[PDB]
Amino acid sequence: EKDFLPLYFGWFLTKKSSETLRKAGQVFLEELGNHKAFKKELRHFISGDEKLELVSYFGKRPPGVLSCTTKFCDYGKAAGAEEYAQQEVVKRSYGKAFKLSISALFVTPKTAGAQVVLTDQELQLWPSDLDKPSASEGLPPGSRAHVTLGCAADVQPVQTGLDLLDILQQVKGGSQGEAVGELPRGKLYSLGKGRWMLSLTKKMEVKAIFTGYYG
Ligand SMILES: NC(=O)c1ccc[n+]([C@@H]2O[C@H](COP(=O)([O-])OP(=O)(O)OC[C@H]3O[C@@H](n4cnc5c(N)ncnc54)[C@H](OP(=O)(O)O)[C@@H]3O)[C@@H](O)[C@H]2O)c1
Numbered sequence: 001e002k003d004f005l006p007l008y009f010g011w012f013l014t015k016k017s018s019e020t021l022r023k024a025g026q027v028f029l030e031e032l033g034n035h036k037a038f039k040k041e042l043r044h045f046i047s048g049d050e051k052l053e054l055v056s057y058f059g060k061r062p063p064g065v066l067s068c069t070t071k072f073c074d075y076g077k078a079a080g081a082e083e084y085a086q087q088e089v090v091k092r093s094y095g096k097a098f099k100l101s102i103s104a105l106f107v108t109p110k111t112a113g114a115q116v117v118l119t120d121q122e123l124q125l126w127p128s129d130l131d132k133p134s135a136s137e138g139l140p141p142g143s144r145a146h147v148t149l150g151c152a153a154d155v156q157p158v159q160t161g162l163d164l165l166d167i168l169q170q171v172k173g174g175s176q177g178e179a180v181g182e183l184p185r186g187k188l189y190s191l192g193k194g195r196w197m198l199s200l201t202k203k204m205e206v207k208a209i210f211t212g213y214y215g
Pocket of ligand 1: 007008062063067068069071072146147148157158160161215
């Protein structure tokens, strides 16, 4: 027989970079929740019902260290998972160190995350797979790349990547609007339908190892 694969592949940030980014994500959620322009849009954010504390709202958080997922394999059950694992480049890079560039932080009524911009070599570790779900269109590859920081209670694993994909798809169409504020890290935007994106002024470099997760 052949040996079974991980739940997923990806970069797994260092203790430091996880701690460094996790705290940075949590400062953002308070700055946002405590922002007037934000408090103006709770009607589009939730359904019913006062000021909301986003850090408890996104109550489902990463147990330990943060990670950027490349290919979710589900132990071989997922499509293209098989071809993706035998790629030479995936085998070349398994165990190698990497640095990732976080260009922005976002929030929607479902997820909080951090956009990841992959380099050209890192993009080679991105699955150029056949069966793109509606969102992938239009955006350069690797755009889906992110790190999950939080999810609302009843939200499913895939949504974080889709939330970012929907947002970028809108910036694509030029519906960003103008920056409605200058958060301490950078520029803020309201995209409607309870969507937001902060474009960091100095992009955050985190160090990580490309490996697989089983658990
Ligand atoms: N013994 C245990 O059971 C144990 C112990 C410790 C921790 N855990 C946690 O339990 C989790 C198990 O995974 P899960 O049930 O949360 O999600 P999952 O479906 O098992 O997938 C795991 C990861 O893959 C990504 N993913 C999930 N669905 C996807 C899809 N349709 N397309 C692309 N990527 C997808 C997500 O990463 P992104 O959101 O980053 O894209 C997610 O964090 C692990 O993440 C681990 O942290 C479990």
